[PDB]
Write a protein that binds this ligand. Structure first.
Ligand SMILES: OC[C@H]1O[C@H](O[C@H]2[C@H](O)[C@@H](O)[C@@H](O)O[C@@H]2CO)[C@H](O)[C@@H](O)[C@@H]1O
Ligand code: AU
Ligand code: AU
Ligand code: AU
Ligand code: AU
Ligand code: AU
Ligand code: AU
Ligand code: AU
Ligand code: AU
Ligand code: ZN
Ligand code: ZN
Length: 364
């Protein structure tokens, strides 16, 4: 309807309606030699009067009402938009600054040819982390840290010179040690199945709790490590059902003076998590049916390191599956309604109960 006109003529605007018969348009409107950040309130869409335009003049938003700004008596939204852009009214040296930072025991600083970009790395106590900026922009290129962090935004607003940038970054690193430290133990003492290749960026970890039962740890806010912590039990219906109670209790009894790993051991009454060990002897014995490969894709490991973990309650149904290879089945089954309303579906193979706890492997 209106996002139509917004799509063809204004790709940088987002028209959000309200059930309150109103309409808010935010986004960017542009002319050939200028653009503005914009927020337009329209109390009476499609009538313009009573309009409330917020244009970012610099640091703050400037407000335009009918008193502020004068429209035409006949204009519609379109008219108002393609008209709007015309009606609205020591410095130190960076190369020196690089040389200033070049030598240091706390990080190696690398300069690209033509010095178009620089890269900090091998940070002390965070040797895995790195930061790349454009020169002399100081525009954020690549970097470690979960992608959900608004580092770019932080830099532009809070970092004036190269040194200020470096430090803002090392600041977050310190802020992030609890997040990182916490995954330290889980990575070394648990058998982490996904992410296949673990990186400074991943806010997640999936590992086995016991035979047939996986536990997926996920940390929404890397700065609010435990506040944003979240556990999900994945496995056969009854195991899931059973363990879900343990989980609740475990959280209620959370020992704040213990990290997540040890707190999980506490939670599930284990002195250690299941993990491959030389003491398992040589496998061979058992020779799990040669087919551990999905069973739909006929692949074992996907381009993203996904692995066949899905399995019905029926011990006798040899047959596993990548969650994504079954993504629709999981959504066409439990569409909307929560998984306690829908615990399972039918094993498309033996018909057995198939826990919908696996849908948890989706999305991410
Ligand atoms: O007798 C089995 C085994 O128990 C312990 O080994 C554990 C190990 O501590 C963990 O990594 C766990 O995930 O699996 C291993 C095998 O059960 C003992 O430490 C080990 O010496 C012993 O053989
Ligand atoms: Au568009
Ligand atoms: Au709208
Ligand atoms: Au140098
Ligand atoms: Au280096
Ligand atoms: Au984030
Ligand atoms: Au934590
Ligand atoms: Au033990
Ligand atoms: Au359907
Ligand atoms: Zn698959
Ligand atoms: Zn089955």
């Amino acid at each position: 309807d209106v996002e139509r006109l917004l799509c063809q003529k204004y790709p940088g605007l987002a028209a959000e309606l309200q059930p309150s018969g109103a309409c808010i348009i935010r986004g960017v409107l542009g002319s050939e030699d200028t653009w503005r950040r914009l927020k337009l309130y329209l109390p009476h869409h499609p009538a313009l009067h009573g309009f409330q335009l917020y244009v970012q003049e610099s640091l703050e938003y400037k407000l335009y009402t009918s008193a502020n700004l004068k429209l035409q008596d006949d204009w519609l939204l379109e008219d108002f938009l393609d008209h709007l852009p015309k009606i609205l009214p020591r410095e130190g040296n960076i190369y020196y600054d690089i040389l200033a930072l070049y030598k240091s025991n706390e990080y190696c600083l690398q300069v690209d040819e033509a010095c178009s970009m620089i890269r900090f790395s091998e940070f002390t106590d965070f040797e895995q982390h790195y930061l790349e900026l454009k020169i002399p922009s100081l525009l954020l290129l690549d970097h470690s840290l979960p992608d959900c962090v608004s580092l770019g935004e932080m830099l532009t607003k809070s970092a004036g010179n190269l040194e200020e940038a470096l430090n803002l970054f090392r600041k977050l690193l310190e802020d992030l040690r609890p997040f990182y430290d916490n995954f330290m133990d889980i990575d070394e003492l648990c058998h982490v199945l996904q992410p296949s290749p673990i990186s400074s960026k991943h806010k997640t970890r999936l590992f086995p709790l016991k035979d047939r039962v996986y536990l997926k740890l996920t940390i929404a806010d890397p700065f609010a490590c435990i506040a944003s912590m979240s556990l999900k039990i994945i496995g056969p219906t009854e195991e899931v059902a059973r363990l879900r109670h343990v989980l609740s209790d475990g959280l209620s009894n959370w020992d704040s003076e213990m990290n997540i790993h040890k707190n999980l051991l506490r939670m599930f009454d284990l002195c250690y998590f299941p993990m491959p060990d030389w003491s398992d002897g040589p496998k061979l014995d058992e020779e799990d049916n040669e087919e551990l490969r999905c069973n739909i894709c006929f692949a074992y490991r996907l381009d993203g390191g996904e692995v066949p973990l899905v399995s019905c309650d029926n011990a006798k149904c040899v047959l596993k599956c990548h969650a994504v290879c079954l993504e629709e089945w999981f959504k066409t089954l439990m569409d909307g309604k929560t998984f306690l309303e829908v615990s399972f579906g039918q094993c498309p193979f033996c018909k057995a109960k198939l826990s919908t706890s696996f849908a948890a492997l989706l999305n991410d």
